[model samples]
Target: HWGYGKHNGPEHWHKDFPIAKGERQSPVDIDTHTAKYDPSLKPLSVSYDQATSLRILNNGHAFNVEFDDSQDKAVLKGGPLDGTYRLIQFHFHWGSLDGQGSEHTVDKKKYAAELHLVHWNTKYGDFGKAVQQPDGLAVLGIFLKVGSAKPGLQKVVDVLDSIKTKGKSADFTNFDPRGLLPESLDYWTYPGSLTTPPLLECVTWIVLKEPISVSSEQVLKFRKLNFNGEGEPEELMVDNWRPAQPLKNRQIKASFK
Candidate 1:
């Protein structure tokens, strides 16, 4: 029950995220005049080291990771950002504590949390055979806003007091999520799929409109987390976002002119 609100957020979270019919949704509303733009992305290198060795999971809804891909140093490139992918997982998409709104509103206006950054395609030999391949994968979207209250996300809200009880998990030691990125790589590229579920159309999204800040008590402790765990009575994972599909003809490319 995690303190019910809205009779239960995320439309009652698909009655326990019931595979929402092959999930692969996201914050799509980025209409930079219907798309088609490129201004060369830039990230030839981005190194940040603190090393917790990495392995944090709260998978009940979000907060997942598996870095230490040989201790990445990060790198980007021209338009669609060159080739060679690695990073495996990283997740997040939020909403709830007030209403629905978690990085999905170019015409609506809900921006609070939305981070993906899942990579693959080392020519498909890893990341579980590049998730089957279509082009493999590549997702990098970052947007979180509360305002004037970000201290680089205090090492991810200090691991939410060790995943604060929802399907509780902990193994943090050093921690270094690239300092919660957002130094502005200026992006907007697309050819999507995989907002979730078997909805793998082979992602290649790279959205970032410049957003970073948190503190409405860290977004209300991520809406009091709780998507069924830590004792498991069921119900209580706030809003795990996912409801932005329909670009079916797909064609969203932009590197910002």
Candidate 2:
């Protein structure tokens, strides 16, 4: 399996997954000065059904909160998206230190961590099918800063102890995904692929401008999550973020000036 290690990291992913070297990759450095403000972009609309949240698990790559996306129970619309996208799952990428670890950067500044809310277009039927199309996925990127204790995140952090090892899962229901978002809907949108393989160029990246607060203690607990299972030589799951990809000919569109 592909991992964020010296031998099998992002640089080596292209060896197996050719799409890793594809033109439209994610985690691009957002240069606000060059980003054009699009007044026509509609306000982002998010409707999440708390009951849709299923379970949280340590998926070896990162901890994911999977949602019951069987129906359009939780959906995202407007913004840079053309149609409603159903919320499938949400995950995070973080580093061992405060200086690095976020996938997306702003003017080359890396945040302490980053959260990804994965959604797929309803028009394509299912997530597996939608991911193959160009206009399929829409991911919301929210940066996490080491500051005040986020009461909202404590609910998730409390369960980390039970899911320290890979493949471990626990019941995580009645959680509103919206509580994780920032106050402002202001974001930068662009065309990019998934940070991980198969690295499909189908995501409409919507990265929030404002960051949410997380305590230093909370971040330390996140780093304790292991990539390996119970018996294996516990590989610390830190720096599981992909490096910023080339911007190429694509231009970032801002929802707000």
| TM-score of each prediction | 0.33, 0.98
Candidate 1 per-residue lDDT, tens place, 1-257, comes to 31234675434544554533333444467777877675445542333352333666776666675565543343332347557666655767777753454645555566767778777766666666666666677777787777667775666666766775555666754555676777776677666666544455676777776767677887777666666667767555556666565555566766657
For candidate 2, lDDT tens digit of each residue in 1-257? 89999899999999999988788999899998999999999899988754378899998989999999988898899998888899999999999899998999999999999999999999999999999998899999999999998788988999999999999999998888878988998999999999988899999999999999999999999999999998999899999999999988899999997
TM-score of 1: 0.33
Can you give the lDDT of residue 174 in candidate 1?
Answer: 54
| C-alpha RMSD in Å of predicted model 1 compared with the true structure | 17.0
Residue pairs in clash, model 1: 23-196, 24-195, 24-196, 25-195, 43-76, 167-230, 226-236, 226-237, 227-237
lDDT of each: 0.62, 0.92
Look at candidate 2 and give me any clashing residue pairs.
none
Best by lDDT: 2
